[PDB]
Short mmCIF file of C-alpha atoms in Angstrom, two decimals:
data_model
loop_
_atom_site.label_atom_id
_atom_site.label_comp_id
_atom_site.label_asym_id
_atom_site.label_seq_id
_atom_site.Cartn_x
_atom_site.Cartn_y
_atom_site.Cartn_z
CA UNK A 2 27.54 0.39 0.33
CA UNK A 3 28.83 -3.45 0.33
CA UNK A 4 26.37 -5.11 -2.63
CA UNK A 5 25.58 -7.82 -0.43
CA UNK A 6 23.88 -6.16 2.21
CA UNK A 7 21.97 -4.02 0.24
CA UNK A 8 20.42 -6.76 -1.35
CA UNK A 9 19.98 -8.52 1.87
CA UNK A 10 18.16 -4.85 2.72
CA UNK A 11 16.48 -5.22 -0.28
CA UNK A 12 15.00 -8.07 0.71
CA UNK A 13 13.49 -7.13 4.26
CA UNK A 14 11.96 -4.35 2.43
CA UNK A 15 10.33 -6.66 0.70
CA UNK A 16 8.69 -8.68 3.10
CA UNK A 17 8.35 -5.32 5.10
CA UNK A 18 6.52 -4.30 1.98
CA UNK A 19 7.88 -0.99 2.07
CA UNK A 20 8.72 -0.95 -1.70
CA UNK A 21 10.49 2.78 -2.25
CA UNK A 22 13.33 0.83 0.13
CA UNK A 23 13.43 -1.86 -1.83
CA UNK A 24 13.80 -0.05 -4.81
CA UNK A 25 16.44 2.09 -3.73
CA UNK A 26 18.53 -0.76 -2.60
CA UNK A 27 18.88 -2.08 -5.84
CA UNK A 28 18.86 0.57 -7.65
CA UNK A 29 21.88 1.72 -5.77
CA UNK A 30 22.90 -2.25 -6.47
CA UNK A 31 22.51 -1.34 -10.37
CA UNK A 32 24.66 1.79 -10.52
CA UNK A 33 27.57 -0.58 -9.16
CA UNK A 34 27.78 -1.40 -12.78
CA UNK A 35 28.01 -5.22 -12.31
CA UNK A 36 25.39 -7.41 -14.39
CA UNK A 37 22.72 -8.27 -11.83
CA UNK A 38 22.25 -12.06 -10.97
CA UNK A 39 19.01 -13.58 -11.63
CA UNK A 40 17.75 -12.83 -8.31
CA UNK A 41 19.09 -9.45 -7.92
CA UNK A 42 17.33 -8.65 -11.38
CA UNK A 43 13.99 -10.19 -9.84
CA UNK A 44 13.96 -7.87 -7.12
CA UNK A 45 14.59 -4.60 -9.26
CA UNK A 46 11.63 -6.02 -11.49
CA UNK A 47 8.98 -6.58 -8.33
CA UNK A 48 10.73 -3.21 -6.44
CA UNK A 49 9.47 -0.94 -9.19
CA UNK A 50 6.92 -2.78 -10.62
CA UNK A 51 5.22 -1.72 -6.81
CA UNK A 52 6.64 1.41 -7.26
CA UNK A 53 5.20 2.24 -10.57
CA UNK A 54 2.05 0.01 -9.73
CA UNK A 55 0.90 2.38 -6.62
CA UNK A 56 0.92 5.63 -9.12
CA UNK A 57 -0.62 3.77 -11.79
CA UNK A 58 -3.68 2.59 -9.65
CA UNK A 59 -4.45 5.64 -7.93
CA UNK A 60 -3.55 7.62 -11.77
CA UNK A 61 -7.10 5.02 -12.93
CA UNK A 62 -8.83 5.70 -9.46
CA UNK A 63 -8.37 9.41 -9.40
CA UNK A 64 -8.80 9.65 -14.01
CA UNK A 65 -12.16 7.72 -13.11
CA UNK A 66 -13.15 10.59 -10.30
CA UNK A 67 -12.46 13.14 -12.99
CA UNK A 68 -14.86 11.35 -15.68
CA UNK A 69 -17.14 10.76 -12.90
CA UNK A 70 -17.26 14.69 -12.34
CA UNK A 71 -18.15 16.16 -15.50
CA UNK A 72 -20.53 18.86 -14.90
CA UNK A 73 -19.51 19.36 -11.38
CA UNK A 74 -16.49 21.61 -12.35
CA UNK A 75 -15.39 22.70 -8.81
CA UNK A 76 -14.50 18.89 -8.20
CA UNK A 77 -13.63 17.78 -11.32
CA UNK A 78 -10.72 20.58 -11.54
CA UNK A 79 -9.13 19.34 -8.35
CA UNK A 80 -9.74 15.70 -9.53
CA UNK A 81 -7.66 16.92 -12.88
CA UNK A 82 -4.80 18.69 -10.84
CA UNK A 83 -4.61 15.37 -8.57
CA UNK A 84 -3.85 13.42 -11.56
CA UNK A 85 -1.77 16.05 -13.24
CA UNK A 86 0.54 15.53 -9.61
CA UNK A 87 0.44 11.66 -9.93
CA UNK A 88 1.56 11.87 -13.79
CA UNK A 89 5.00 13.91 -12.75
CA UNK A 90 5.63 11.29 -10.06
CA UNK A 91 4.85 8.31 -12.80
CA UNK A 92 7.12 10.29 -15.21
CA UNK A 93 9.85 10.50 -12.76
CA UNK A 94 9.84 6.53 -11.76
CA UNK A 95 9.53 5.88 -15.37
CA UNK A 96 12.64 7.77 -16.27
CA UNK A 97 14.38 6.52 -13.07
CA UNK A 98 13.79 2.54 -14.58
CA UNK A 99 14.43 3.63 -18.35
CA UNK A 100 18.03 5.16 -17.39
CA UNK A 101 18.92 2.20 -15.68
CA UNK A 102 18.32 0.51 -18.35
CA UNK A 103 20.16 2.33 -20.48
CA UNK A 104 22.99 3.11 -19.02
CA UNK A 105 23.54 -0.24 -17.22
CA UNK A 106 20.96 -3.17 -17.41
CA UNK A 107 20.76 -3.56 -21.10
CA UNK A 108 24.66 -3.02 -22.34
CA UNK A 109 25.62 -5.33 -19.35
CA UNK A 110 22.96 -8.48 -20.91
CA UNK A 111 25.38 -11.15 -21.94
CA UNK A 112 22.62 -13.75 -22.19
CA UNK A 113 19.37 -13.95 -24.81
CA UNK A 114 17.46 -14.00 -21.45
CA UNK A 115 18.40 -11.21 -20.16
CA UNK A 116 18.49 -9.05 -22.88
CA UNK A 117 14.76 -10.43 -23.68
CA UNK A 118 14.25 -9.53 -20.00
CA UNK A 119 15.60 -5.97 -19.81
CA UNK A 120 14.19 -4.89 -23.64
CA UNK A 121 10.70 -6.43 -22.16
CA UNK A 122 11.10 -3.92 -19.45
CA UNK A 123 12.05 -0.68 -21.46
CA UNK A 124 9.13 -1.37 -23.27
CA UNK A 125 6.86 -1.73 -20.14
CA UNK A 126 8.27 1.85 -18.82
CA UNK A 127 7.50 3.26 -21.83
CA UNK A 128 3.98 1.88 -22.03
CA UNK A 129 3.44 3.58 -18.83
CA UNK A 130 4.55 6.77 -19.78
CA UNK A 131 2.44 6.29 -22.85
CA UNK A 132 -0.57 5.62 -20.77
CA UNK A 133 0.27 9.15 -19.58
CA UNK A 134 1.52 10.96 -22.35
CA UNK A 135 -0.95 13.91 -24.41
CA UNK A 136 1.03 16.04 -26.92
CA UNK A 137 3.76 15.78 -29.55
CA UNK A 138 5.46 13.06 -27.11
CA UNK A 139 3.06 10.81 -27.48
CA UNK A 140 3.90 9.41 -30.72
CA UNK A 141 7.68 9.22 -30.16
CA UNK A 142 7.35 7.24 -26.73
CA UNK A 143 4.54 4.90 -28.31
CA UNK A 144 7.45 4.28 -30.89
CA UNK A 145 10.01 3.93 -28.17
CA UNK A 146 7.76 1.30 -26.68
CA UNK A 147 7.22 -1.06 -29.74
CA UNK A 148 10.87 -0.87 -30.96
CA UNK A 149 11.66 -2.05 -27.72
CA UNK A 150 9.67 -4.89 -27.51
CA UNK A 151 10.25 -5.68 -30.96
CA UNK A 152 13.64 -6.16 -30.24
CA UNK A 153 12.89 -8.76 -27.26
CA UNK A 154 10.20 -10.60 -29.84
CA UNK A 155 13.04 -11.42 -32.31
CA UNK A 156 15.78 -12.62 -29.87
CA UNK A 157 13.12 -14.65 -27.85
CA UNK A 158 11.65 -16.43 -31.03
CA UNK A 159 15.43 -16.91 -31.98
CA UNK A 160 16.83 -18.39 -28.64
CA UNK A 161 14.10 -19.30 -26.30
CA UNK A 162 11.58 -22.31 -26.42
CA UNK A 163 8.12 -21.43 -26.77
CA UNK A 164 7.09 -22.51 -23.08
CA UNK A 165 10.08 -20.24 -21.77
CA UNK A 166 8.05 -17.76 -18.85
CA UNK A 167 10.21 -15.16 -20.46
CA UNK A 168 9.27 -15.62 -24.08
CA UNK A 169 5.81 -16.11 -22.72
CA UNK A 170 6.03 -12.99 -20.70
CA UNK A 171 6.94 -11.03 -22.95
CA UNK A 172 4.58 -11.82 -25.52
CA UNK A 173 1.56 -11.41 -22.71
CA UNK A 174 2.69 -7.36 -22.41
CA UNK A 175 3.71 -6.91 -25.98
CA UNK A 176 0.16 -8.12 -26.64
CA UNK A 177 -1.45 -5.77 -23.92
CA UNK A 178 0.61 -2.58 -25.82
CA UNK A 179 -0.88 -3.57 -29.15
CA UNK A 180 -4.39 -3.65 -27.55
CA UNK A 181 -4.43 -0.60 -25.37
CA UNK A 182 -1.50 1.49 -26.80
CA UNK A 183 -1.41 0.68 -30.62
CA UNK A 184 -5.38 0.32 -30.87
CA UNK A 185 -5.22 -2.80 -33.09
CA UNK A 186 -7.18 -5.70 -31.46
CA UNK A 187 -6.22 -7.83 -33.99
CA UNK A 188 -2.16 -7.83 -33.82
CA UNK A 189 -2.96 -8.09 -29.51
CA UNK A 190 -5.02 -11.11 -30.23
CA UNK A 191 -2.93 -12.71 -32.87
CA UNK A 192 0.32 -12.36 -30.83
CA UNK A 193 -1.69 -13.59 -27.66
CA UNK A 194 -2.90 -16.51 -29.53
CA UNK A 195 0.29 -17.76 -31.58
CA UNK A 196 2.51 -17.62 -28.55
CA UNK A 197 -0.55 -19.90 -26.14
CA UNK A 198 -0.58 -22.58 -28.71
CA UNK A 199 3.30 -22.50 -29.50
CA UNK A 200 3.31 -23.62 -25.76
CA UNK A 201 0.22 -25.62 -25.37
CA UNK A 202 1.92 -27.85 -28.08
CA UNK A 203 5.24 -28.29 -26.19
CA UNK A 204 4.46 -28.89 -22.76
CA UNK A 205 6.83 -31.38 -22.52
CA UNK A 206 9.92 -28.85 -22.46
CA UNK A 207 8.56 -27.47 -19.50
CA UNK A 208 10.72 -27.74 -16.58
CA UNK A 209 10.18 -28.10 -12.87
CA UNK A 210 11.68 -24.90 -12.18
CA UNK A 211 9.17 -22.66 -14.16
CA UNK A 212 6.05 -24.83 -14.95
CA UNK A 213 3.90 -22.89 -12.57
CA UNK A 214 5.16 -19.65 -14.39
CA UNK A 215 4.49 -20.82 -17.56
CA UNK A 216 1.23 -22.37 -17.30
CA UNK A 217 0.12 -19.02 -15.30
CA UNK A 218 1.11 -17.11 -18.31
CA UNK A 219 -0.34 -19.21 -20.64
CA UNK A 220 -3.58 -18.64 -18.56
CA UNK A 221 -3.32 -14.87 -18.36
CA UNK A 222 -3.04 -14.89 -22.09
CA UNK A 223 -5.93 -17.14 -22.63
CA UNK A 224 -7.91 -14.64 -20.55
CA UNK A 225 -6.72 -11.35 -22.20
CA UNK A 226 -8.05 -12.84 -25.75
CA UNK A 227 -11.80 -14.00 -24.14
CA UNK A 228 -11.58 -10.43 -23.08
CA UNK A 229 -10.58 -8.54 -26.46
CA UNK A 230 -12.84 -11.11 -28.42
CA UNK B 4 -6.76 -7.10 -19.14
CA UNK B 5 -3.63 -8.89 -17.81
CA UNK B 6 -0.01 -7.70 -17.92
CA UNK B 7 2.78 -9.53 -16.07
CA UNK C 3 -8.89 27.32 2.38
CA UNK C 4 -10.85 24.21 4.61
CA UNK C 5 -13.44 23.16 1.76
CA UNK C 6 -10.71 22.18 -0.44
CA UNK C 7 -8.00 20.78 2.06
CA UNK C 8 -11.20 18.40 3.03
CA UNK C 9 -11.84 17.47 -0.61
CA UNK C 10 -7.89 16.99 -1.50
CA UNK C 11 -8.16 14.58 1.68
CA UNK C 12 -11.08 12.72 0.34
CA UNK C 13 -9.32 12.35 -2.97
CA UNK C 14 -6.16 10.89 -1.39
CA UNK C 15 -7.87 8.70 0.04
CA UNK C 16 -9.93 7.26 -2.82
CA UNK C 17 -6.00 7.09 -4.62
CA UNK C 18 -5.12 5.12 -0.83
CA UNK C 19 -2.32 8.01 -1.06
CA UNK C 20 -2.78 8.44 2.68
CA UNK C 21 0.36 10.34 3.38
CA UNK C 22 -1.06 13.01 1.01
CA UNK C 23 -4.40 12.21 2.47
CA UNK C 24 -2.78 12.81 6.06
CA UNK C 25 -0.93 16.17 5.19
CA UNK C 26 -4.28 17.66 4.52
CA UNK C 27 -5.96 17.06 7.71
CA UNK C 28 -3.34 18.14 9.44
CA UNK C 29 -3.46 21.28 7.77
CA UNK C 30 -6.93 21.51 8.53
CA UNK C 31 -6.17 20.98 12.12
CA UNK C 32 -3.74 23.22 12.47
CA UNK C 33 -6.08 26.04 11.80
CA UNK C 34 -7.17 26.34 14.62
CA UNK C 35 -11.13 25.61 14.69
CA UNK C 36 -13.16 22.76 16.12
CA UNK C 37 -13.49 19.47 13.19
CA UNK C 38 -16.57 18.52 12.09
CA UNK C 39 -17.65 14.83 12.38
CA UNK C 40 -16.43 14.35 8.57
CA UNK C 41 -12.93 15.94 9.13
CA UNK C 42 -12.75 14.18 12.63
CA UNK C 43 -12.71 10.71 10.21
CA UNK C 44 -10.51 11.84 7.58
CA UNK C 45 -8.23 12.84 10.26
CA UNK C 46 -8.62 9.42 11.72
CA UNK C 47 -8.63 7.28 8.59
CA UNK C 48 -5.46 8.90 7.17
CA UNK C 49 -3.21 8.59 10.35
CA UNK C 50 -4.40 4.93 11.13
CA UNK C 51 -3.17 4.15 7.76
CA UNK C 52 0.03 5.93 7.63
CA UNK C 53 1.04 4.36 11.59
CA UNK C 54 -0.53 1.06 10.17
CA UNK C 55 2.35 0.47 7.38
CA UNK C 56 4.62 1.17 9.93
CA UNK C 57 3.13 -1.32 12.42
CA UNK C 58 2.91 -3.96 9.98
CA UNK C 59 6.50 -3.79 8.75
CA UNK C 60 7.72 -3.48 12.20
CA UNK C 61 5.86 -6.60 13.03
CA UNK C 62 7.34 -8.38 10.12
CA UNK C 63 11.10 -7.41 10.59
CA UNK C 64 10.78 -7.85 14.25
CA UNK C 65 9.50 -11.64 13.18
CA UNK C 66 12.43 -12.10 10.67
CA UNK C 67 15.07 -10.62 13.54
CA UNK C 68 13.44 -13.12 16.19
CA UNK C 69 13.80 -16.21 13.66
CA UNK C 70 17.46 -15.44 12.53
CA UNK C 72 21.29 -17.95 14.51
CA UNK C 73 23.07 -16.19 11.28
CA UNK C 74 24.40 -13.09 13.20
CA UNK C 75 24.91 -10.78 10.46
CA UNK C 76 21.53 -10.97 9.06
CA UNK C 77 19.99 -10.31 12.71
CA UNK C 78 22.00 -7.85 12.35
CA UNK C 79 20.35 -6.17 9.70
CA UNK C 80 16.80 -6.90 10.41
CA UNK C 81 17.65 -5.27 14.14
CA UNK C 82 18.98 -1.98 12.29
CA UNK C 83 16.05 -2.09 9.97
CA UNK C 84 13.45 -2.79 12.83
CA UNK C 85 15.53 0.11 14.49
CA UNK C 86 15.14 2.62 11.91
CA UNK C 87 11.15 1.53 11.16
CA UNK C 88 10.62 1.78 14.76
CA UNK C 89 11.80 5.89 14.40
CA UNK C 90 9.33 6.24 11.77
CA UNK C 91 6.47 4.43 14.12
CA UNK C 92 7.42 7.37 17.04
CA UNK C 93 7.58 9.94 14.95
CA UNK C 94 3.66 9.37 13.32
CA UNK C 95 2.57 8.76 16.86
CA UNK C 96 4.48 12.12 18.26
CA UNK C 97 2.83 13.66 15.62
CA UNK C 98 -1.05 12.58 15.92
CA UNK C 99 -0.15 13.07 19.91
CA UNK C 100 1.20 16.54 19.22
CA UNK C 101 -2.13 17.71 17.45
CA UNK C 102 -4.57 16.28 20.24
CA UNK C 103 -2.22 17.76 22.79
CA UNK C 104 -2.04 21.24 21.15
CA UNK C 105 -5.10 21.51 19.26
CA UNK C 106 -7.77 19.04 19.54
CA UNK C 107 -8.27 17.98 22.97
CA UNK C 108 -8.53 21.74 24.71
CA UNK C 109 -10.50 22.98 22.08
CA UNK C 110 -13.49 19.77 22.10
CA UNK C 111 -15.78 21.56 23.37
CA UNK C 112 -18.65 18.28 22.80
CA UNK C 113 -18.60 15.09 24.87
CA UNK C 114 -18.47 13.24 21.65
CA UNK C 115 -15.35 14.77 20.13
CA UNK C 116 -13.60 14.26 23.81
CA UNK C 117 -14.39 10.77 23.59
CA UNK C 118 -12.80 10.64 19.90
CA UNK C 119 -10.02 12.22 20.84
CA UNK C 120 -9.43 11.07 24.28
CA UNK C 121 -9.72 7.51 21.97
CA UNK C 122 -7.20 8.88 19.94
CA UNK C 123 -4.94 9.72 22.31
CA UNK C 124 -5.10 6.28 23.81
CA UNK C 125 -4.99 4.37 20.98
CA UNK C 126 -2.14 6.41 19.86
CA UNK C 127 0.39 5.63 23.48
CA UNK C 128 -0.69 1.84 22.77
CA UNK C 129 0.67 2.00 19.63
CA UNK C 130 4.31 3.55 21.10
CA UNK C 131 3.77 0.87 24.16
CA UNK C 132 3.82 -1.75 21.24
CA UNK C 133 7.52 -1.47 20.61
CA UNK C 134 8.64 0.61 23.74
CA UNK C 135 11.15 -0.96 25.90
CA UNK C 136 11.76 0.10 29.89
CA UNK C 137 11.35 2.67 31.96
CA UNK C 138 10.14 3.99 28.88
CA UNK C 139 7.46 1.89 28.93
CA UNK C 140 5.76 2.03 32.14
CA UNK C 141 5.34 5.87 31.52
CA UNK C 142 3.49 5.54 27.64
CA UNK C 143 1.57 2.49 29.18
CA UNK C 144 0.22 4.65 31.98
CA UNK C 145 -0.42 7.84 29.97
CA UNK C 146 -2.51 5.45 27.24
CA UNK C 147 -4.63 3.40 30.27
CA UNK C 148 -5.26 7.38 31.92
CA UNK C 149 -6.65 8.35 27.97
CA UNK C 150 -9.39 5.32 27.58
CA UNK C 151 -10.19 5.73 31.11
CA UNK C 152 -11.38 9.31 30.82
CA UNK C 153 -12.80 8.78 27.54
CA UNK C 154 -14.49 5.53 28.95
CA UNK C 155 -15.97 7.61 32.07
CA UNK C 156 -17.35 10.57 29.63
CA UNK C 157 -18.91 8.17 27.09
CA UNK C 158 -20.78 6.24 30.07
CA UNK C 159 -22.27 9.47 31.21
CA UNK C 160 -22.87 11.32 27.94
CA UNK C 161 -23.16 8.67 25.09
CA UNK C 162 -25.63 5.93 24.28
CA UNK C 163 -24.36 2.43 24.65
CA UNK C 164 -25.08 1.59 20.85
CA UNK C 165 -22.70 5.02 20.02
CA UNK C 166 -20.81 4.09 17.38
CA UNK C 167 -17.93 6.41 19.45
CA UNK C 168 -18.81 4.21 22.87
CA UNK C 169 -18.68 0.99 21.08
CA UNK C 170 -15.31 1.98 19.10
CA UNK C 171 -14.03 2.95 22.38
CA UNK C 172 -14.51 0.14 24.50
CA UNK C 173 -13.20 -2.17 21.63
CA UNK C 174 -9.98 -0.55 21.73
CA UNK C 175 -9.94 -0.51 25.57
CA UNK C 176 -10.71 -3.88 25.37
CA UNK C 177 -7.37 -4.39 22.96
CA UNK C 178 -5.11 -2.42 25.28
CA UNK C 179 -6.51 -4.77 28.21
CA UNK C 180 -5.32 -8.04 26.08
CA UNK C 181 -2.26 -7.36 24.65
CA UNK C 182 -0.81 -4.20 26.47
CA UNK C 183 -1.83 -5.19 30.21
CA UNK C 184 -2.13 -9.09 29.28
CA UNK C 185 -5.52 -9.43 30.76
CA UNK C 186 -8.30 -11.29 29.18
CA UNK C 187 -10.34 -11.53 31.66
CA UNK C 188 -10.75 -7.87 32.33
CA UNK C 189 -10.43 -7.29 28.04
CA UNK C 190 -13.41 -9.85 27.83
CA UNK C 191 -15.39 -8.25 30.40
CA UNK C 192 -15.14 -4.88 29.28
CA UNK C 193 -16.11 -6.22 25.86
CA UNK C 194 -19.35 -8.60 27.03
CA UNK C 195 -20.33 -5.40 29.06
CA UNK C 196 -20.06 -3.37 26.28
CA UNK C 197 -22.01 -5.57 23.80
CA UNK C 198 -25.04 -6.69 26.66
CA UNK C 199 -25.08 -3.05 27.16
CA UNK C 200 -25.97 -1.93 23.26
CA UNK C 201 -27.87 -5.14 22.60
CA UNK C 202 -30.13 -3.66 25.81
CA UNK C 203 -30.85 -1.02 24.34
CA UNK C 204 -31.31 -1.03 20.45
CA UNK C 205 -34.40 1.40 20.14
CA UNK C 206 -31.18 4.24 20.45
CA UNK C 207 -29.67 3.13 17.13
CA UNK C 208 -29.89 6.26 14.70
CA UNK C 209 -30.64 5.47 11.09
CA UNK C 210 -27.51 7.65 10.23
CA UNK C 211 -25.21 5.07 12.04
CA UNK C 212 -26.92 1.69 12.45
CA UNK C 213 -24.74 0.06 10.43
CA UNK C 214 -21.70 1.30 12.27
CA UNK C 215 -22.99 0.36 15.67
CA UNK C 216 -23.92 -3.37 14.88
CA UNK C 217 -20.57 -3.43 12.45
CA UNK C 218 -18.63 -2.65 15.93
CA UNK C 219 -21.19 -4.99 18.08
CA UNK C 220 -19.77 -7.65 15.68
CA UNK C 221 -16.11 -7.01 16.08
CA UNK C 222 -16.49 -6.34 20.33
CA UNK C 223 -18.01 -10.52 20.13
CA UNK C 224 -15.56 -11.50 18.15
CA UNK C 225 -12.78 -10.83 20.11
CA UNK C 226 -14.75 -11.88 23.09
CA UNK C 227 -14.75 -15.41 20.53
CA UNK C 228 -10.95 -15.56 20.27
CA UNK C 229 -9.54 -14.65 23.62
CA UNK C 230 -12.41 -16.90 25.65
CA UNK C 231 -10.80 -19.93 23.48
CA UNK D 4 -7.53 -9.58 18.08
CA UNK D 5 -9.46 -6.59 16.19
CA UNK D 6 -9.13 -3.12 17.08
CA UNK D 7 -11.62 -0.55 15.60
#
């Protein structure tokens, strides 16, 4: 429909929490083919980050069940086909957020942030489908992954300060894929480390608008490297 | 550990 | 095949996929035989959960409408409060559909009438939340007609630390308060209950102890918030 | 007010 009231929708979803609304609003905002506003982009991010958060959590619950189960093969199968059901459903949502991207959100960036933001996302969709992923996929999508947020590591060290939530953000999931997707502690840990004390020693070009952001991130990557260490 |  | 509709439902739930988790048990119940105590809560547990979304978004959006002034906006939250509220009927026509056609004529145990004479009440409060008129009147009678028959078969039949009992007069309690707006009569019916099961504790069952005096708990709470 |  009209792009204003399906953000406006978008929003009472929202605080309705009823996030498959939400997410249709703007994707159906998206495939208008104008570049999103900063606040139309946020509420893509959080509708499908719920979205794709809801498979992913019951995906660990139900995977745990089926470890859980082993030698109790009556259960353990249905646990298996459960999870087999919640993959297809994380597949789909994936692709749904990865063809946006494509198609619209990333040719559309016409700022460093933006781009940083949307090639940041491509590679969180596909390190969920990683999470996910078994045979001679695998490998390709891992690739997919890392290229992508390779791409949003160089622009961000290029154009954004180091205490950016952005730059910071993205260096907080890149490090999470090295860790979990790439196996190699020690890249996680190193790009974890380098971007908290980039920002720890520039606190003064934090602004007013994002501090809060910032110093969460900063926090959340502290934490991640007492945890890998 | 902590994503965004 | 019943084992495995009951497992799937257990599994749901565990994912908190409770649509899934509700599409199960209502596949067990439309087969036709009596539920055990363990499908009777899955049954329970899936359908408060999928009405519960509803309820909470409705409240929500109903807020936002009340609070918007900017007439295109209220607008919008109306319509969306509109279409949520079409959702909320439909769960509830549902549940009421199975206790009508299945459940109720086929308890043949005091305690599953209770539960599902519960049910059934709990289920018309729920559509009195958000009915309007004439409309109303009718779902506020037919809910107040289901907790009084289930409250008259629990007094004879049940224990007053039940679990079932207690649950029962809670929600009766509820409907008193915020369907019929009256506290006095909600806070009675709750005291009573509670004097009633802390009169008699030497009838808690080790199976459900912990139920009972989780439900004692709740009944003098709310007693605690409406008395001040 | 809680209901069950």
């Amino acid at each position: 429909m009209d792009k204003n009231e399906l953000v406006q929708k978008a929003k009472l979803a929202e605080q309705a929490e009823r996030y498959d609304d939400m997410a249709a609003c703007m994707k159906s905002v998206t495939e208008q083919g104008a570049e999103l506003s900063n606040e139309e982009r946020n509420l893509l991010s959080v509708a499908y980050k719920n979205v794709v958060g809801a498979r992913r959590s019951s995906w660990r619950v139900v995977s745990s069940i089926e470890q859980k189960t082993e030698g109790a093969e009556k259960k353990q199968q249905m646990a298996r086909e459960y999870r087999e059901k919640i993959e297809t459903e994380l597949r789909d949502i994936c692709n749904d957020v990865l063809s946006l991207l494509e198609k619209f959100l990333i040719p559309n960036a016409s700022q460093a942030e933006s781009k940083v933001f949307y090639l940041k996302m491509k590679g969180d969709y596909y390190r969920y489908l990683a999470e996910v992923a078994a045979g001679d996929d695998k490998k390709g999508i891992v690739d997919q992954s890392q290229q992508a947020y390779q791409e949003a590591f160089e622009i961000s060290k290029k154009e954004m300060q180091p205490t950016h939530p952005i730059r910071l953000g993205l260096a907080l999931n890149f490090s999470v894929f090295y860790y979990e997707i790439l196996n190699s502690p020690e890249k996680a840990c190193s790009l974890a480390k380098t971007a908290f004390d980039e920002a720890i020693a520039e606190l003064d070009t934090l602004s007013e608008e994002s501090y809060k952001d910032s110093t969460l991130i900063m926090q959340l990557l502290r934490d991640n490297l007492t945890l890998w260490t | 550990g902590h994503s965004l």
